[PDB]
């Protein structure tokens, strides 16, 4: 059997309180952007990866270092050293 669940649904996305489900249901119409390509700081969404990649260009950031396991990056090597730690279960090659 099922009891059911309900409650208030605020447009946290922007911060608009909506009690009438009918209202919100449509309110979303505005927030319609399911693009996995979004800036790090800006709220811009691109369809094609490249698009986002280029957008990052304008942003002056010196990140010569780049992790292997993850596409992560750091301005200094030191930072990367501590970052790696994260990768605890790094399944890879190992002789012996
Ligand atoms: Zn909203
Ligand atoms: Zn940006
Ligand atoms: Zn990493």
UniProtKB/Swiss-Prot annotation:
Complex formation: Interacts with ZNF70; this interaction promote the transactivation of the HES1 gene. Interacts with NOTCH1.
Zn-finger segments (C2H2-type): 9-31, 37-59, 65-87
Subcellular location: Nucleus
Cited function: May be involved in the regulation of mesenchymal cell differentiation through transactivation of NOTCH1 target genes.
The protein's name in its UniProt record: Zinc finger protein 64
Family affiliation: Belongs to the krueppel C2H2-type zinc-finger protein family.
Portion of the parent chain present: 174 to 256 of 645
